[PDB]
Design goal:
This is part of a larger assembly, with chains A (about 210 residues) and B (about 300 residues).
Chain A (H helix, E strand, L loop, with lengths): L3 E3 L3 E4 L5 E7 L7 E6 L7 E4 L3 E2 L7 E5 L3 E6 L8 E7 L8 E2 L4 E4 L7 E5 L3 H6 L2 E10 L4 E7 L22 E9 L9 E8 L6 E6 L2
Parallel strand pairs in A: 2-11
Antiparallel strand pairs in A: 1-3, 3-8, 4-5, 4-9, 5-6, 7-8, 9-10, 9-11, 12-13, 13-15, 14-16, 16-17
Chain B lengths: L5 E4 L4 H12 L9 E7 L5 E6 L13 E4 L4 E5 L8 E4 L3 E3 L1 E5 L7 E3 L9 E3 L10 E14 L3 E5 H19 L4 E4 L7 H4 L1 E5 L2 E5 L7 E2 L10 E9 L1 E3 L6 E3 L9 E13 L8 E6 L4 H9 L2 E5 L2
Parallel strand pairs in B: 13-21
Antiparallel strand pairs in B: 1-6, 2-3, 2-19, 4-8, 5-7, 5-22, 9-20, 10-11, 11-12, 11-20, 12-17, 13-16, 14-15, 15-17, 18-19, 20-21
The chains are: A mainly beta (about 210), B mainly beta (about 300).
Bound molecules: 2-acetamido-2-deoxy-beta-D-glucopyranose (12 copies).
Chain lengths: ~210, ~300
């Protein structure tokens, strides 16, 4: 019944700088609180446990602080490898009913980079299939916040389409959206112009890139 | 004193079972395990284990003396004698309101903080002939023993050496003078019985009592040692004394656990030997907390009003 809330849903900060994470707990969990670190596609990593004690073999930059219902995994000079989602685990009640925090992404904050929209039409081969897929890539950009709109014949219709951002990269450290309007065969043929409006923060103004069937 | 002659049988005394059952209930609301496992069979061999998980509050379980007063329609009879087998016709019996204050100490091998023997060291046994019946020793002079969650207990090598003597002498004074008396460690069995187990601060201590029961009616062991130090260990997963089954208690926490008890008695158990040459081997025993209670009620017996 214990709720563990990690307030900073997302924390953008730069390497070398100090990053701070705060795990909020329902009732008191005393000191039975651990912190984990998860790289995309990896098993978590036990960082801290018992609230303020680092796990064997862990960088001293990770500071475990707190007790009661207020814990803090503060990090001194954050590191390139220190990018990951952080999790707090509560394990104080008994019977065992341990709960995890909802997370916190420790993303690298960099320069507001604008997205270069590439609209890809549905390959005829794919259209011969029975459907059509218009891919509207959004290469290398930062604040993952990038509202995209699919306008069919200048129609703000918003439905049959599905986005997919990528993780933070290595070198560039940017994101790449990917909105995909998947229409039919008889309705793809029923419409003329297919536009994709990207409204990014680092975009001086809305940038519509489209195409007409052909 | 009461002017009458009555029968007594500490080995079949009913108060023992009445206290034991009480001491158990004195444990179900003071020391509650995080998990308790207990056999559950229909008889068909196959036996599932009944598991129970409750809160595991760290409480510094400190035993309070317990009196036993007869209500009404009932009267307690006490036996009086400097050496009472506790199993026969008592001459100096006498009715009492409540039995002396008894501190229900649950332990094995050594009886802690019990009641000393007025005269000398006495050893009772439901049958000394039977190498299966626990021999309850009653010290007339206790031997302080201090245990600590730090991992051990200290005992006076002096006092313990004497004690084994004034016990070893009371033994042959029952099995045959022209008989050698020896003391060996537990033969085997559960950790709780093989070592001197007991509870201190709610922590289940398990002290290795080898140095206390490896005495040969010939040599000594005080070379470079003033005090005996038993390497004790606190366990979380233990075999229950209240009933067959394990029980897990939460780890220790208090900055310090400490005990200073009076070794007021023992629980020995000589090995059969099948009538072999005079060489009786006595080893630590107990594990059946009732013998404990017994050692305290050996001279009592509640009876119905007339
Ligand atoms: C286990 O024990 C239960 C008793 O509650 C018994 O009814 C059952 O037949 C046994 N077999 C199982 C379920 O393992
Ligand atoms: C009983 O205790 C007295 C002192 O209280 C001691 O002198 C005596 O020897 C003891 N009896 C024995 C040897 O068991
Ligand atoms: C046990 O502790 C007591 C204090 O409670 C002390 O007087 C005694 O000397 C100790 N016994 C030992 C360590 O032999
Ligand atoms: C012990 O047995 C008797 C006493 O009953 C004694 O006369 C004899 O000399 C002794 N013999 C032994 C067993 O050494
Ligand atoms: C302590 O006890 C173990 C068995 O419980 C025994 O094997 C070991 O030799 C003992 N150590 C000492 C103190 O002699
Ligand atoms: C008992 O005797 C054996 C062998 O004679 C010896 O190894 C052991 O240490 C003795 N017990 C002690 C310590 O008094
Ligand atoms: C044996 O050691 C004890 C202390 O451990 C000491 O009191 C005693 O005097 C020693 N034995 C002798 C008489 O040398
Ligand atoms: C009982 O044990 C304590 C603890 O060491 C001791 O100091 C005290 O003198 C003992 N009292 C008795 C029963 O003689
Ligand atoms: C009585 O014996 C118990 C053993 O469980 C010990 O913890 C307690 O300290 C002893 N009495 C005293 C002196 O407190
Ligand atoms: C007693 O000691 C052994 C016991 O194993 C036995 O063989 C022997 O005959 C008896 N008497 C002796 C020789 O001491
Ligand atoms: C107590 O003394 C009286 C003397 O008249 C006697 O009748 C009674 O049997 C005695 N009781 C005991 C202690 O056996
Ligand atoms: C019990 O009565 C007998 C008979 O007179 C007496 O010898 C004995 O001392 C009494 N015991 C005590 C002290 O209660």
């Amino acid at each position: 019944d214990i709720v563990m809330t990690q307030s900073p849903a997302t924390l953008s900060v730069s390497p070398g700088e100090r990053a701070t994470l705060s795990c909020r707990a329902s009732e008191s969990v005393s000191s039975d609180l651990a912190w984990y670190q998860q790289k995309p596609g990896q098993a978590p990593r036990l960082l801290i446990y018992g609230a303020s004690t680092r796990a064997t073999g862990v960088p001293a930059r990770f500071s475990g602080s707190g007790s009661g219902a207020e814990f803090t995994l503060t990090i001194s000079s954050l590191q390139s490898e220190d990018f990951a989602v952080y999790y707090c685990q509560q394990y104080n009640n008994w019977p065992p009913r341990y709960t995890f925090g909802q997370g916190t992404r420790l993303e690298i904050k960099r320069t507001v980079a604008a997205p270069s929209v590439f609209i890809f039409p549905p390959s005829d081969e794919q259209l011969k299939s029975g459907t059509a897929s218009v891919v509207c890539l959004l290469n290398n950009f930062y604040p993952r916040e990038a509202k995209v709109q699919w306008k069919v014949d200048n129609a703000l219709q918003s439905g049959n389409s599905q986005e997919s951002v990528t993780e933070q990269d290595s070198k560039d450290s940017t994101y790449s959206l990917s909105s995909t309007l998947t229409l039919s065969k008889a309705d793809y043929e029923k419409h003329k112009v297919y536009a994709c409006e990207v409204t990014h923060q680092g975009l001086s103004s809305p940038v519509t890139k489209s195409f007409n069937r052909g | 004193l009461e002017n009458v002659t009555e029968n007594f049988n500490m080995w079949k005394n009913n108060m023992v079972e009445q206290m034991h059952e009480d001491i158990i209930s004195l444990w179900d609301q003071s020391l509650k395990p995080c998990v308790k496992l207990t056999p559950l069979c229909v008889g068909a061999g196959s036996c599932n284990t009944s598991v129970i998980t409750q809160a595991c509050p760290k409480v510094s379980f400190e035993p309070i003396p317990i009196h036993y007063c007869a209500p009404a329609g009932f009267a307690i009879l006490k036996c009086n004698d400097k050496k009472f087998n506790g199993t026969g016709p008592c001459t100096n019996v006498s009715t009492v309101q409540c039995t002396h204050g008894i501190r229900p100490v649950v332990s094995t091998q050594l009886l802690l903080n019990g009641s000393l023997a007025e005269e000398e060291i006495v050893i009772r046994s439901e049958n000394f002939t039977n190498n299966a019946k626990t021999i309850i020793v009653q010290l007339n002079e206790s031997v302080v023993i201090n245990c600590t969650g730090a991992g051990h207990c200290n005992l006076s090598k002096t006092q313990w050496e004497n004690t084994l003597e004034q016990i070893a002498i009371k033994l042959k004074e029952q099995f045959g003078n022209n008989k050698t008396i020896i003391f060996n460690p537990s033969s085997g069995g559960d950790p709780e019985i093989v070592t001197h187990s007991f509870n201190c601060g709610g922590e289940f201590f398990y002290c290795n009592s080898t140095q206390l029961f490896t005495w040969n009616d010939t040599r000594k062991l005080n070379n470079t040692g003033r005090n005996i130090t038993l390497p004790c260990r606190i366990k979380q997963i233990i075999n229950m004394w209240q009933e067959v089954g394990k029980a897990m208690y939460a780890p220790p926490i208090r900055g310090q656990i400490r005990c200073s008890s009076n070794i007021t008695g023992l629980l020995l158990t000589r090995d059969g030997g099948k009538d072999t040459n005079g060489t009786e081997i006595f080893r630590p025993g107990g594990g059946d907390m009732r013998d404990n209670w017994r050692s305290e009620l050996y001279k009592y017996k509640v009876v119905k009003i007339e």
